């Protein structure tokens, strides 16, 4: 006979032979629905997904005949850890039914949200109306009503559901040999290997604390600048050394500070770079945009697209009567079938979302000869970071001038570089303390370090010590203000937006010093260099078969995440804000 490892090899070969043939059916049945929405195409999708689930559950029941302590090879061990993985099938049937009812009741309460005025109540906006009220209103008494009404008509109902969701998810997580649900979420970044390449779940918290304490001074300077401009905007409402009110920061939750760009602008007499008119005068369409993106990706050494990409992709909105979803995605259907669904309009913003969306296809084309279970990025944040590190190289005037879009006589003074770095920072550095604070609060809630009588005493204390944001109205212990976000009511992890901004400037600062750049980092361009494509493709080809510290060493030559390449990008802005602000930096916790 054979030993345990040869039985494991035979089982994994039998799984890999039948998984490829059955996953492409379930992916093509969903592609045929997302581009043609009828009721006949929403039934085949469910039948194919039921066939796939009934295959996967039987193979996962078979896979538990192998003890994990007998495998000596790393890749077979990695493919059996994913397959054994009991999941939520450790509770009883009543607990499972109750958890599946709670998880859809919360999403139903969030999705149907209606807020009317404390004035004349004939206006009752939906979610997409309140998101557009707070985006472009400069009134102190409109945004206060919208903020308080959304947090008292949605977050007031989710609290007795969240109080049971926490307990049921903790009981689900203490069945698979974890401690809380926070350990189940931090086990995404756990690897094992030789000396230096390992990573535990209890090291991620110390790592993100170290990175945030490294990154905080640039945020303090940016916060002081935004507060000094908002004091000019709304008079007699903001303290000259206090926190910012929560209902004035661009949108409903204060996640991105992008809509403060018309208020906190630098020296305004500089019209921006908008190549939309030059693109329309040269008669560009969707095919020309994707051909230019493929030329950019072939300039650095990555391969060209398949011939079944220009014939099956939905690169434009149809006109033969079909109803589609117009959110851009990149698909990885199976046996060398890569398609992109995108409603392309001829603009500058849809020229960057083609170089972004073809950055996922070039990643999925690189690990394509791995096993079935190991065809993913090395982390949950590796896949949307490699697509955003190559949208930084195409928005530079080094690239838009060599393509024929910008004229040859363009003026790159420093008053256009500051006006670009500020608009980058208001979307990139303004959302890191919010992400870190929300995930830290959820970890402390799931661990048991915040009892249920302090879920709002600790939310607005953390939001004043970390983010620097005060509340406009006193919220007592009957609201649930974190539960009125989309990722909290719909059960998603949020640290993948923090460990993705770090490993994007870590990628860019290593790709620009191997393309022999001379200057600041925000003017770099990795086009026309086949030496950067090799260092990129030596990371892209690994998939999920190696520990992600090894795949990070393959590009950045360091096996730890650090925020030193992020403060090298924004260094002109950090030198300019220290001259503009003076010594008004900081806030008092009140």
């Amino acid at each position: 006979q054979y030993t345990t490892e040869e039985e494991a090899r035979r089982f994994l070969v039998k799984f890999n032979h039948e998984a490829e043939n059955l996953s492409h059916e379930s992916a093509l049945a969903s592609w045929d629905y997302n581009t043609n929405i009828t009721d006949e195409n929403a039934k085949k999708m469910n039948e194919a997904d039921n066939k796939w689930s009934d295959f996967y559950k039987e193979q996962s029941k078979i896979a538990q005949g192998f003890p994990l302590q007998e495998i000596k090879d790393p890749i077979i061990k990695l493919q059996l850890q994913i397959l054994q993985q009991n999941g939520s099938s450790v509770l009883t049937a009543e607990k499972r039914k109750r958890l599946s009812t709670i998880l859809t009741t919360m999403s139903t309460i969030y999705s149907t949200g209606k807020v009317c005025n404390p004035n004349n109540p004939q206006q009752c906006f939906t979610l997409s109306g309140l998101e557009d009220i707070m985006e472009k209103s400069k009134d102190y008494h409109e945004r206060l009503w919208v903020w308080e009404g959304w947090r008292s008509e949605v977050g007031k109902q989710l609290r007795p559901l969240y109080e049971e969701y926490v307990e049921l998810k903790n009981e689900m997580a203490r069945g698979n040999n974890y401690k809380d649900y926070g350990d189940y979420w931090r086990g995404d970044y756990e690897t094992e290997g030789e000396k230096g390449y390992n990573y535990s779940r209890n090291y991620l918290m110390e790592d993100v604390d170290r990175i945030f304490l490294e990154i905080k001074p640039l945020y303090e300077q940016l916060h002081a600048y935004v507060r000094a401009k908002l004091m000019k905007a709304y008079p007699s409402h903001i303290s000259p050394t206090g926190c910012l009110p929560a209902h004035l920061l661009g949108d409903m939750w204060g996640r991105f500070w992008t809509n403060l760009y018309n208020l906190t602008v630098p020296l305004e007499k500089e019209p921006n770079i908008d190549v939309t008119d030059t693109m329309k005068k040269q008669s560009w369409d969707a095919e020309k945009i994707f051909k230019e993106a493929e030329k950019f990706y072939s300039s650095v050494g990555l391969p060209n697209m398949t011939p079944g990409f220009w014939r099956d992709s939905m690169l434009t909105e149809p006109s033969d009567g079909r109803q589609v979803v117009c959110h851009p995605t990149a698909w990885d259907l199976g046996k060398n079938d890569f398609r992109i669904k995108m409603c392309t309009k001829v603009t500058m913003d849809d020229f960057l979302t083609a170089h972004h969306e073809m950055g996922h296809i070039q990643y999925d084309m690189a690990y394509a000869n791995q096993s079935y279970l190991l065809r993913n990025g090395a982390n949950e944040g590796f896949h949307e970071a490699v697509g955003e590190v190559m949208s930084l190289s195409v928005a530079t005037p080094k690239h838009l001038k060599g393509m024929g879009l910008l004229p040859s006589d363009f003026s790159e003074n420093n008053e256009t570089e500051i006006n670009f770095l500020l608009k980058q920072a208001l979307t990139i550095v303004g959302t890191l303390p919010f992400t870190y604070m929300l995930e830290k609060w959820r970890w402390m809630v799931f661990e048991g370090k915040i009892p249920k009588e302090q879920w709002m005493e600790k939310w607005w204390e953390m939001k004043r010590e970390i983010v620097g944001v005060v509340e406009p109205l006193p919220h007592d212990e009957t609201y649930c203000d974190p539960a009125s976000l989309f990722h909290v009511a719909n059960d998603y992890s949020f640290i993948r937006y923090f460990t993705r901004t770090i490993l994007e400037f870590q990628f860019q600062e290593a790709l620009c010093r191997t393309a022999k750049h001379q200057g600041p980092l925000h003017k770099c361009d990795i086009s026309n260099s086949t030496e950067a494509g090799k260092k990129l493709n030596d990371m892209l080809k690994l998939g999920k078969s190696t520990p992600w510290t090894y795949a990070l060493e393959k590009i950045a030559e360091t096996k730890e995440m650090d925020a030193k390449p992020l403060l090298n990008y924004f260094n002109p802005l950090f030198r300019w804000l220290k001259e503009q602000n003076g010594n008004s930096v900081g806030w008092s916790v009140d």
Binding site: A8, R9, L12, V13, N16, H17, E20, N21, H24, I75, I76, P303, N304, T306, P307, G308, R311, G334, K335, N336, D337, A368, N369, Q370, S371, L374
Partner: protein
């Protein structure tokens, strides 16, 4: 000396690109302008030879590979372009003079029979417990997945397996007239060059 016959190239159905048909000629007399006037030549890309010198010299042997191939995908047969074509279907040999003709077979040439779909292979590999072991082609040789691919593909991405070997096809229908592809390789003999132009 004697006339070479092109009725092997001028009857039946032209096969797909992976199952290409070879037309090795030896010791006859050719007139390639008789051949290339029956078609609508849209490309005459040659290597280490000119189209004028292809129809004037005396060679020891003459080889023609012909298959059904749409002229849309004409940028994948170009030397050097690792794509699901030169890796799995047909890789041209470059240690010899060669020319690549792409035709547009007309309505009047009724002796050619139109097939149902065009076809190629998207992958041909051998499975393991560690991933996929791709089996790339050889210059001028057939794919090792030819005994599997000769069962017929009926839909897009329909695989076929026997043991460890796996292939995957891709078909799409024919619109308009037929388009072919002719790879014409010559070889120089040391003493006898008996494949001369027809005089």
């Amino acid at each position: 000396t004697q006339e070479c016959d092109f009725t092997p190239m001028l009857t039946g159905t032209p096969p797909p690109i992976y199952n290409f048909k070879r037309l090795v000629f030896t010791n006859c007399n050719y007139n390639l302008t008789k051949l290339l006037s029956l078609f609508q030549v849209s490309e005459f890309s040659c290597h280490q030879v000119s189209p004028s010198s292809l129809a004037t010299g005396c060679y020891s042997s003459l080889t023609v590979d012909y298959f059904a191939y749409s002229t849309d995908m004409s940028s994948y047969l170009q030397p050097g372009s690792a794509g699901a074509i030169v890796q799995f279907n047909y890789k041209q040999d470059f240690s010899n003079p060669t020319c690549r003709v792409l035709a547009t077979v007309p309505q009047n040439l009724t002796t050619i029979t139109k097939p149902s779909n065009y076809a190629y292979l998207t992958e041909c590999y051998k499975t393991s417990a560690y991933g996929k072991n791709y089996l790339y082609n050889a210059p001028g040789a057939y794919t090792p997945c030819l005994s599997l691919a000769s069962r017929g593909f009926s839909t897009k991405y329909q695989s076929h397996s026997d043991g460890e070997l796996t292939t995957t096809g891709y078909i799409y229908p024919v619109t308009g007239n037929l388009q072919m592809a002719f790879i014409i390789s010559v070889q120089y003999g040391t003493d006898t060059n008996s494949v001369c132009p027809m005089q």
